[PDB]
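Re: weekly structure request thread

Next one in the queue (107 aa):
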Amino acid sequence: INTFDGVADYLQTYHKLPDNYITKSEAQALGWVASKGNLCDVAPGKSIGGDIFSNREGKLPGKSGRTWREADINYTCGFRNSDRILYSSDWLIYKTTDHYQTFTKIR
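Done, posted below.
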């Protein structure tokens, strides 16, 4: 489960990310070196997902008590790509395919 549609349904259907996701910190603990693009060598079949996404720029809709999280989409080993899914604690789902510059609602 690593497609935009897959993960969105999943997030709304189950209220968590699918088993293939791990956080950055979690990843570093297993030997992931961002500079080497080695996530698949140290954690086969996993993607970075679940971290808190600051929304400093105020690009995504704010609401007191609403927390945003991100997850990588379409990852297939090597260096991470520019696709991400963004989901709020009240299950609003946005997408970015340009490294968090622009967002469009998907759920």
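Residues 4-14 form the longest helix (11 residues). The chain has three helices and six strands.
Next request, please.
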